[PDB]
Amino acid sequence: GMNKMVINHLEKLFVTNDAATILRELEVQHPAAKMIVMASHMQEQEVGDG
Amino acid sequence: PLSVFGDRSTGETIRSQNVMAAASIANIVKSSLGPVGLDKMLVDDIGDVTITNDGATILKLLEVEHPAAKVLCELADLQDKEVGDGTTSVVIIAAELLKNADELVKQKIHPTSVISGYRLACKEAVRYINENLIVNTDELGRDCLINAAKTSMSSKIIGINGDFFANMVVDAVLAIKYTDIRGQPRYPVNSVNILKAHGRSQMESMLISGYALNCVVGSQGMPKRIVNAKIACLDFSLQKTKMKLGVQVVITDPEKLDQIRQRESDITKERIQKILATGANVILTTGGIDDMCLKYFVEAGAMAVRRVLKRDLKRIAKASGATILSTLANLEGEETFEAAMLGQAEEVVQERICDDELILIKNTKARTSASIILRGANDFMCDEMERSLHDALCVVKRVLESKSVVPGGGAVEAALSIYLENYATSMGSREQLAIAEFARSLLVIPNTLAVNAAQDSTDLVAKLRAFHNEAQVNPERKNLKWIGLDLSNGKPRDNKQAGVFEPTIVKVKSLKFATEAAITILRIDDLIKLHP
Amino acid sequence: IQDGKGDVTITNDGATILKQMQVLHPAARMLVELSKAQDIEAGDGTTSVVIIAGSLLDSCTKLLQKGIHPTIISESFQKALEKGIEILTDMSRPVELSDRETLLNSATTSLNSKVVSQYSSLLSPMSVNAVMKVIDPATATSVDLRDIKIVKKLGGTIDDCELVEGLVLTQKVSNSGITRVEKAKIGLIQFCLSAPKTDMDNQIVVSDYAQMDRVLREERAYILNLVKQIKKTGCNVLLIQKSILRDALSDLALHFLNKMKIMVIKDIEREDIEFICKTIGTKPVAHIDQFTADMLGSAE
Amino acid sequence: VILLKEGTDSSQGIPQLVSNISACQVIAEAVRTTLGPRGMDKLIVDGRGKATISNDGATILKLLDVVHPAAKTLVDIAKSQDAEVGDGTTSVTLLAAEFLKQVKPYVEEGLHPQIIIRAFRTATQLAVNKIKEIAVTVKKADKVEQRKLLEKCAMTALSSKLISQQKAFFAKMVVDAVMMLDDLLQLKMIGIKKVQGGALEDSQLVAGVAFKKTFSYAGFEMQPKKYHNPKIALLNVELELKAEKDNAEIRVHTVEDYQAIVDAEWNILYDKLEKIHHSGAKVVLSKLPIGDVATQYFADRDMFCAGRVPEEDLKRTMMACGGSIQTSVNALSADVLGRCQVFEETQIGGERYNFFTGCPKAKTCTFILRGGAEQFMEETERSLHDAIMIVRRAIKNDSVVAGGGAIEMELSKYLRDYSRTIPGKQQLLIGAYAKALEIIPRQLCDNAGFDATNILNKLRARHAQGGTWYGVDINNEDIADNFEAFVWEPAMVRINALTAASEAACLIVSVDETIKNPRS
Amino acid sequence: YGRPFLIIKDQDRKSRLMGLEALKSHIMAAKAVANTMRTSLGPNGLDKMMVDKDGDVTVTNDGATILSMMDVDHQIAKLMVELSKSQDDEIGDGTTGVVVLAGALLEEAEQLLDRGIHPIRIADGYEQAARVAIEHLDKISDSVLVDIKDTEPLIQTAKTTLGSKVVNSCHRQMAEIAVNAVLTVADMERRDVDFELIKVEGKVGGRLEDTKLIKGVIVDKDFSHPQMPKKVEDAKIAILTCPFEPPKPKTKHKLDVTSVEDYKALQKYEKEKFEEMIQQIKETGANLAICQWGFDDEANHLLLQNNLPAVRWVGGPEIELIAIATGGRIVPRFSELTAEKLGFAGLVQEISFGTTKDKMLVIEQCKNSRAVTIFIRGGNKMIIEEAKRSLHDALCVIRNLIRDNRVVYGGGAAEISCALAVSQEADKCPTLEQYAMRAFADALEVIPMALSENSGMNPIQTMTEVRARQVKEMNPALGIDCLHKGTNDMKQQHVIETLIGKKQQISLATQMVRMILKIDDIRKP
Ligand SMILES: Nc1ncnc2c1ncn2[C@@H]1O[C@H](COP(=O)(O)OP(=O)(O)O)[C@@H](O)[C@H]1O
Ligand SMILES: Nc1ncnc2c1ncn2[C@@H]1O[C@H](COP(=O)(O)OP(=O)(O)O)[C@@H](O)[C@H]1O
Numbered sequence A: 001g002m003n004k005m006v007i008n009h010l011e012k013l014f015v016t017n018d019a020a021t022i023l024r025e026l027e028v029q030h031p032a033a034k035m036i037v038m039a040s041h042m043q044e045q046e047v048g049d050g
Numbered sequence B: 001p002l003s004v005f006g007d008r009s010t011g012e013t014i015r016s017q018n019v020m021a022a023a024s025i026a027n028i029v030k031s032s033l034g035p036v037g038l039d040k041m042l043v044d045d046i047g048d049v050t051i052t053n054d055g056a057t058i059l060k061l062l063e064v065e066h067p068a069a070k071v072l073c074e075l076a077d078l079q080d081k082e083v084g085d086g087t088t089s090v091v092i093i094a095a096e097l098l099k100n101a102d103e104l105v106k107q108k109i110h111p112t113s114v115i116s117g118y119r120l121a122c123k124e125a126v127r128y129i130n131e132n133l134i135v136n137t138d139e140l141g142r143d144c145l146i147n148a149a150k151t152s153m154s155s156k157i158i159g160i161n162g163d164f165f166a167n168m169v170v171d172a173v174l175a176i177k178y179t180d181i182r183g184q185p186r187y188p189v190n191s192v193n194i195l196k197a198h199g200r201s202q203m204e205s206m207l208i209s210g211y212a213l214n215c216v217v218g219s220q221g222m223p224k225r226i227v228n229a230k231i232a233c234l235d236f237s238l239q240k241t242k243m244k245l246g247v248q249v250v251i252t253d254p255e256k257l258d259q260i261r262q263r264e265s266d267i268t269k270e271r272i273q274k275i276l277a278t279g280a281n282v283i284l285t286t287g288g289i290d291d292m293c294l295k296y297f298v299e300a301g302a303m304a305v306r307r308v309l310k311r312d313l314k315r316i317a318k319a320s321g322a323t324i325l326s327t328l329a330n331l332e333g334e335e336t337f338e339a340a341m342l343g344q345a346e347e348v349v350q351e352r353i354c355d356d357e358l359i360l361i362k363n364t365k366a367r368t369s370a371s372i373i374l375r376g377a378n379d380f381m382c383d384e385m386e387r388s389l390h391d392a393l394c395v396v397k398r399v400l401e402s403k404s405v406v407p408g409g410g411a412v413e414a415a416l417s418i419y420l421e422n423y424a425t426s427m428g429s430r431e432q433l434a435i436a437e438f439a440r441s442l443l444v445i446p447n448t449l450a451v452n453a454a455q456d457s458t459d460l461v462a463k464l465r466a467f468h469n470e471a472q473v474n475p476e477r478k479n480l481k482w483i484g485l486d487l488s489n490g491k492p493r494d495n496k497q498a499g500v501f502e503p504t505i506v507k508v509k510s511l512k513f514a515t516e517a518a519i520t521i522l523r524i525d526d527l528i529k530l531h532p
Numbered sequence C: 001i002q003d004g005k006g007d008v009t010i011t012n013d014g015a016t017i018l019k020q021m022q023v024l025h026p027a028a029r030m031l032v033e034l035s036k037a038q039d040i041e042a043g044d045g046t047t048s049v050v051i052i053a054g055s056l057l058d059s060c061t062k063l064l065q066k067g068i069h070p071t072i073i074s075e076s077f078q079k080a081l082e083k084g085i086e087i088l089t090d091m092s093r094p095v096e097l098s099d100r101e102t103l104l105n106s107a108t109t110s111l112n113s114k115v116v117s118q119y120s121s122l123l124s125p126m127s128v129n130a131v132m133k134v135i136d137p138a139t140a141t142s143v144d145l146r147d148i149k150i151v152k153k154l155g156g157t158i159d160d161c162e163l164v165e166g167l168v169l170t171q172k173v174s175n176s177g178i179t180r181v182e183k184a185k186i187g188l189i190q191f192c193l194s195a196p197k198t199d200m201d202n203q204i205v206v207s208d209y210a211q212m213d214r215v216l217r218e219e220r221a222y223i224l225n226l227v228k229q230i231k232k233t234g235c236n237v238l239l240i241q242k243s244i245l246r247d248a249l250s251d252l253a254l255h256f257l258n259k260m261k262i263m264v265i266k267d268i269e270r271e272d273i274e275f276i277c278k279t280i281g282t283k284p285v286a287h288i289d290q291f292t293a294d295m296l297g298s299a300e
Numbered sequence D: 001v002i003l004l005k006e007g008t009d010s011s012q013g014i015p016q017l018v019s020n021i022s023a024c025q026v027i028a029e030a031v032r033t034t035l036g037p038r039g040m041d042k043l044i045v046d047g048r049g050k051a052t053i054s055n056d057g058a059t060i061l062k063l064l065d066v067v068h069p070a071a072k073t074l075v076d077i078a079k080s081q082d083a084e085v086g087d088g089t090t091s092v093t094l095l096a097a098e099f100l101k102q103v104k105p106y107v108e109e110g111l112h113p114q115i116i117i118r119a120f121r122t123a124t125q126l127a128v129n130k131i132k133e134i135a136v137t138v139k140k141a142d143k144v145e146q147r148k149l150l151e152k153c154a155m156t157a158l159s160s161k162l163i164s165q166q167k168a169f170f171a172k173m174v175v176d177a178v179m180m181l182d183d184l185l186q187l188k189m190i191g192i193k194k195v196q197g198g199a200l201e202d203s204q205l206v207a208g209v210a211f212k213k214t215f216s217y218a219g220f221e222m223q224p225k226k227y228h229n230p231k232i233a234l235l236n237v238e239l240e241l242k243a244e245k246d247n248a249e250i251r252v253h254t255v256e257d258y259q260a261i262v263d264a265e266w267n268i269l270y271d272k273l274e275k276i277h278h279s280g281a282k283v284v285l286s287k288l289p290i291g292d293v294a295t296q297y298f299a300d301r302d303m304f305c306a307g308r309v310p311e312e313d314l315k316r317t318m319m320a321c322g323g324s325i326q327t328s329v330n331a332l333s334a335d336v337l338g339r340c341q342v343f344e345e346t347q348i349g350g351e352r353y354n355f356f357t358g359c360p361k362a363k364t365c366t367f368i369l370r371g372g373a374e375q376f377m378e379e380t381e382r383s384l385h386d387a388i389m390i391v392r393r394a395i396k397n398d399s400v401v402a403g404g405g406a407i408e409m410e411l412s413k414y415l416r417d418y419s420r421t422i423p424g425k426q427q428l429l430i431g432a433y434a435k436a437l438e439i440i441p442r443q444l445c446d447n448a449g450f451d452a453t454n455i456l457n458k459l460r461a462r463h464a465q466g467g468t469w470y471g472v473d474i475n476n477e478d479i480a481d482n483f484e485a486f487v488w489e490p491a492m493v494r495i496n497a498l499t500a501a502s503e504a505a506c507l508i509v510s511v512d513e514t515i516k517n518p519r520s
Numbered sequence E: 001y002g003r004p005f006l007i008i009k010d011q012d013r014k015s016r017l018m019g020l021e022a023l024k025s026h027i028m029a030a031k032a033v034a035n036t037m038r039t040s041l042g043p044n045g046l047d048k049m050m051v052d053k054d055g056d057v058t059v060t061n062d063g064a065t066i067l068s069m070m071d072v073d074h075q076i077a078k079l080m081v082e083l084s085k086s087q088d089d090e091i092g093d094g095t096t097g098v099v100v101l102a103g104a105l106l107e108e109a110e111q112l113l114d115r116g117i118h119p120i121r122i123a124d125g126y127e128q129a130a131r132v133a134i135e136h137l138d139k140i141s142d143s144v145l146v147d148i149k150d151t152e153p154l155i156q157t158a159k160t161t162l163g164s165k166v167v168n169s170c171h172r173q174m175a176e177i178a179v180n181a182v183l184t185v186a187d188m189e190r191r192d193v194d195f196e197l198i199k200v201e202g203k204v205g206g207r208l209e210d211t212k213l214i215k216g217v218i219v220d221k222d223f224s225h226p227q228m229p230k231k232v233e234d235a236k237i238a239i240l241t242c243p244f245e246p247p248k249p250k251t252k253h254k255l256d257v258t259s260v261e262d263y264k265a266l267q268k269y270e271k272e273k274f275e276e277m278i279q280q281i282k283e284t285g286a287n288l289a290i291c292q293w294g295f296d297d298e299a300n301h302l303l304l305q306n307n308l309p310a311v312r313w314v315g316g317p318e319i320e321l322i323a324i325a326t327g328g329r330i331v332p333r334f335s336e337l338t339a340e341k342l343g344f345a346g347l348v349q350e351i352s353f354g355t356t357k358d359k360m361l362v363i364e365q366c367k368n369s370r371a372v373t374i375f376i377r378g379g380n381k382m383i384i385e386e387a388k389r390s391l392h393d394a395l396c397v398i399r400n401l402i403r404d405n406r407v408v409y410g411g412g413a414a415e416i417s418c419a420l421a422v423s424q425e426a427d428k429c430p431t432l433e434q435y436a437m438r439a440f441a442d443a444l445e446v447i448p449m450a451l452s453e454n455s456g457m458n459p460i461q462t463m464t465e466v467r468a469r470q471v472k473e474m475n476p477a478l479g480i481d482c483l484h485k486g487t488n489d490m491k492q493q494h495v496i497e498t499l500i501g502k503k504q505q506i507s508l509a510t511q512m513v514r515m516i517l518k519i520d521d522i523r524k525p
């Protein structure tokens, strides 16, 4: 998996391929996508992978 | 310092800017190269959308401001005019070798040396192409034409049905043979009229023997089919005779008035009977025809076609043997018409198309002619087939004019590069570097080909497209020099086996034009942009 | 150089570079005038003269800083130029014509600093042949470049440049039936092959029905008479001067010319008549009565 | 409704990576002309109007306002190389940009970034191993040769700076400033004080401690400015009239008690001053301010006072004289007051400077460097910091390697030879790595106005079989044995440059897509 | 690719100059600065009239001051200003000379690099020529005697320095007062001169001839309670810090007066505190009291009726100077004022300065006073300021001569001799580097050219003739006859420049021009 670079709303560079990190530091406005974001973050909190 | 009131860019800045502009144009045109290249969509400001693949049309439709890219656009247009096929190839080659030359210059190599190196390299590449990479299309006939047309169509929209289209192409080109110097055949393409219809599928495109005029019968009264066509081509309109600007009538006694009014029509009448006296039943004219003359034609039984263009009427006159007439006047002082200057055609019928009707002229007596009607799904599809068919016609014309073809699929460029590296081994001056770089630039087209088919280029060009090493160092292994990349498995295959050939004109002209355009754009040392 | 409008040029001649570049300083304008004057007088060195002038002005700035009156510097520069002209004259060697080798050397040297340098082997011999085929190399004392017509057309490559001892036209043949002529008899025309019309006000009045037939027949007969007089002299290709206020070619006239198997070239500029006459040896006619084969140009 | 917030800009695929590579070369072009003895200088004007003049990669890249993430990576690599070894900031940026430029041809077609990243990792591991196994160590532990090694390393460091013509004058100088440091090599133990006026060769190294005249009151200029064997009373207490506790309230109801308390404040101040005087110290120093009353008290008894001294200068005085700072005054013993050979207040370029010189056991130093402009002395200080950092790093191990592009050419030859046994595509990538590592001598020749191609070909021919250590001799316009020409560099700078450049190249290549948010 | 990428924040407005064009711009700005500073050089030079943003005007010839007030924006001009200020700091004289030398050197550098020579090579040549020039300058110098017994060489040097400034209207007493002030203040054993002991004070009115050197202290105060005598004879002085007010602890305090008896006790305490204060001032025997922090009405009247004149509100530095002059000690409390802690005053007098209400005190010492004071009088504020900066230049020259003792014979002779040495060395030097040496020679030799041009003579011919005279007869003290007295020999004309001043000029200009040549790229918003 290739690393991805994200510029947050405060102009901070995040280069990484960790799905939870790029998903958190990337603003999402759709409701269903927010649902999937919540599910993935809960998975990260419960286990740490997946 | 200087008082110029403008902008000045000097040194490495303008060189890098020119290289970037050339690379931008090359990157726009690059994705539409090869049989696996997918064509582009160009939509205007107002919504006039077109779908095209050829580089010339893409570059002409694009709006370019940087002159270093305008040079490449004009190069593509020139390659389109002089040859017709290989328009993307010339732009890609020119931009790539310009980039390589700039890379050389960045290491403080004088641009005069690299220009001389490219110029000599182009001479030697043309010599190598003309000497060791041409096969005569004389022992191979009626099949090299089909293969060349098919490989020209492969990248186009009509490539899927190439085996059906290529055929009519050569047939069209075989119906255009002409003699100029009494012993040298010529093939005047642009004399095959191409018509666009947007009805049924591609498989039912029509190849019409004889012309296919895009006009309609003047009035519904006259018949729309003539069993034996006596065509009377005219460059002379038929309306009531307004006298002239200089001449104006003046009536003193009233009685003399009405008479001249009858004359004001009768003159026209008379000419019509003369045209109808020689058994003529088809009337073609560039000028308009008013209602009374149409009435004469319907009463007699002949059809009249008005507002026919000049080029199609000239083609019809040449094909049917008719003599176009600006006026009805002999070497004496009396108007007359002769039956010896009437064209004869086997049929003339107004045939209906998707919604409209067009006139077909079938089996003209004098010389065989041809026309093509392309059926497509919509107007965009039809015009794209028209452009592809024009490209194929040009390719077949080039092949027949010069009976010599070279392998396609990047075979010639790989062979040129691998020979030119060893050529530039000699001439141990700094100049040799330039020549060597030229060789590497010749690799830009094969690699991108493998790029466009979801394959890896340099993963295979190292050895798979290096069979030319043995084809060069070993004269007994020459049969491998006709090898090019194949995208069914991404392997070096003998192009002679698959039949991928292109006329040597495309390669020679593309190389010469690309290297000269690069030389012209590379002499730039600085730019002065004057304020408007 | 790209001017205000989107037109560009790739220039190495100093005169062109300085002219296209719209300078604003008076010294710069005087320098560009100097460059164009040097081009007019010689034609080469239009960069070196500007470089010399600017360089020795930069030399004299420190002379001004050293407390020297400008008049002394000017007079001393005049004396230095006087000595330098003699130095250059002594340094030279005599050159005499018919020595093609030194002429080719000079042409190649002139072309070395240009983009066409690599073509100089196929472009300098014709460059000197152009001059040697215009002026007599015995008693000349000057040559003219006006009678060296440089015609440029887009397409091809540089290696396709050509030198022709004949005449080149960018005009187009009106009758698209005849393309080549062997043993051509060229004749310039300065009058008009159309319906007659006097210089002062022209008017025709028709009062009867036969008059329309009469005027049509008479105009056709007049045009046919003119074309017959043109043809009976053996003229096989015709050159019509570009005429305004009267149609140079009528469709009926062109039809008759085509009928008698002739080639017609129309719309020829007035200023080109001298060039054509000096090239193909023809003499212009402004009246049909003086159209004779005794003064009709000929070509192979 | 759209998935992301409006104004989000995303770039994916090959063109994004190629644009990142091009941005890397563009940002590395800004410091390219600042290598080698013929290196040039960069002037950067801030938004406030202040202009900084320097020719080190780290400072120039920091001063440049960078917003491209790949150019940001180049800035970070330069800054980290500065923070690790101090010298070699331009080399890391140029090496990273040259790696990326050499590989971009291969990335133009469909080359998977993982394979080229692996090629970089293998090539850089082999390169670091070769550098470790080629650098020569004298392994003699003798003072004369150690001094020569440090002097030559410092001299090579001072080249390509503003202090080039005075290399030998400054180089050995900074060596002394590292000789007289303890076995911790703290960078705060050698101070740098900049003063306007004077020539570049008027700079000096105070083996004790020198600092600018802090302040004075009505009573100064009366105590003598020259003591020949004084005792320094380092203090941390203010000696002036003040409130006892900043919240102490005095509550009395008789005038006798009022007068007693006034006399009591005066008495406590005088008793504190009497303790200081009876300690035997002659010159006193204090972080906290010294009032006018104490100034007059010490003037009346031939004692020098100096208040509001900086913390760093007071600690340097501690490390020079050998005393200890006492916040309390009740315990001025005899083993806590530092002593120095000579104390003297002198005039330097329109300022007054106090000097404590002649300390026998000194673990600190002070640099009085002169100049004509503030940027002149600032650039001199930057060069001196570069030199002291390189000597500080080299003092841990005296393993050296020839500079002037010799080591880069040696690694290039080694990698070229190695990339013939390895079959497949990795051979081409390792060859690209070696051709990229070939950049430093070319850029040195370009800055020196040489024929870069000719000198590179001569280096390659003479260095394939004719012997290592051969770099570019700028003065002779040719190639020369740079180890025998005493152009020495510690191997750690090249090791760190190579590993950092590899890491940055891998990080830049390993990106396939970038996203920019609307930066709310 | 088609997409243009952005790397630098706000990069659409930033400007960049690179390559040789940037160096041309640098050299051009330096040439402009040097041309501005050229006219005001030498005795025949003309002043410059600088007006600041507040609109206040000052007419001055000091190059460092002129460039400091030059509100300039070019970075090279800022570097030139810093050059001039640093030369003023280290030496105090020759502030225009460094600017002119740097401009000439950069102009020669431009001429050289037009011929495609590396700027670093030019800098190396400049450094070598500077070394040669400094060695020759040290070889050519001779020494004067820094002693009170034979002070005349000091007057000669100060008079040469005071030339080209308005104070040359007097030109003899200014040098005398400068030499006397520096000699008195200087600590000869340490060879150090302290400028805080020379309170250069000015006041409008009078004439420039009235500028005197008080071997004491002048202060801008007046006797409080004007009923007291306006002057006292040789008097014992009591320099004091604490005010004549009832004391109070620094710590915040509350004094609760809880009864009428407490109120009476507080009243008596205050009254007796004043009385005891005055009594213990008088008991020491001092005639004059001086207080830093001022005092109140009761102290005034008690001081008056006890025949003890006093002044108040004397500043800190003024208190220190008074105590140094009188030989007394500053005491911060009345209870520790002994007889030994008084100072001596030859006489303390009050002066009124004409019709204005302003008053001043003069304290004249009959004993050794380590401090002095230069008092300046004139008809304009501009004259006063120019006079005091010119006298500061003279004092700086005198102290430089104290700390170095060696002189060279200026007026252009030093520059011409150094130029000949540089050219002679450059003769026997391998090529590719002698061009920089000869450029350095010409650049340093422009100074006589500018001197002669300012003097009105033809520069080139006069300079060539004096150089020929210097090379024919080995007399390296031949300079431009700027004052038109004949005698190209500059020994007889008595022109003296300090060796450290000239060598600092050369070294500092060489280093600044090296930095300027080093710069390649400029990035500015
Ligand atoms: N069937 C095929 N097999 C291998 N190569 C092919 C085949 N058809 C076309 N090519 C190659 O792909 C390229 C396509 O060029 P193309 O883009 O059609 O020319 P143009 O630029 O005129 O449109 C040609 O250079 C040709 O060599
Ligand atoms: N005397 C010299 N001769 C040749 N090359 C040198 C010399 N001194 C330094 N170099 C080269 O200069 C490079 C470093 O340049 P410099 O600007 O001094 O430091 P940085 O590495 O921070 O840019 C080194 O690679 C070294 O090889």
Ligand SMILES: Nc1ncnc2c1ncn2[C@@H]1O[C@H](COP(=O)(O)OP(=O)(O)O)[C@@H](O)[C@H]1O
Pocket (backbone or CB within 6 Å): E040, E041, E042, E043, E045, E063, E093, E094, E095, E096, E097, E160, E161, E162, E163, E164, E165, E410, E411, E412, E451, E479, E480, E481, E482, E483, E495, E497
């Ligand atoms: N009487 C004099 N005759 C000739 N030259 C003089 C004379 N007085 C001063 N000069 C020269 O004038 C130059 C400039 O002196 P001045 O303008 O007074 O101060 P600064 O040196 O600060 O410019 C000095 O270098 C000195 O040699």
Ligand SMILES: [Mg+2]
Pocket (backbone or CB within 6 Å): A019, A049, A050
């Ligand atoms: Mg994971």
Ligand SMILES: [Mg+2]
Pocket (backbone or CB within 6 Å): B085, B086, B087, B152, B155
């Ligand atoms: Mg094609």
Ligand SMILES: [Mg+2]
Pocket (backbone or CB within 6 Å): C044, C045, C109, C110, C111, C113
């Ligand atoms: Mg020329």
Ligand SMILES: [Mg+2]
Pocket (backbone or CB within 6 Å): D087, D088, D089, D157, D160, D386
């Ligand atoms: Mg360094």
Ligand SMILES: [Mg+2]
Pocket (backbone or CB within 6 Å): E093, E094, E095, E161
């Ligand atoms: Mg002076």
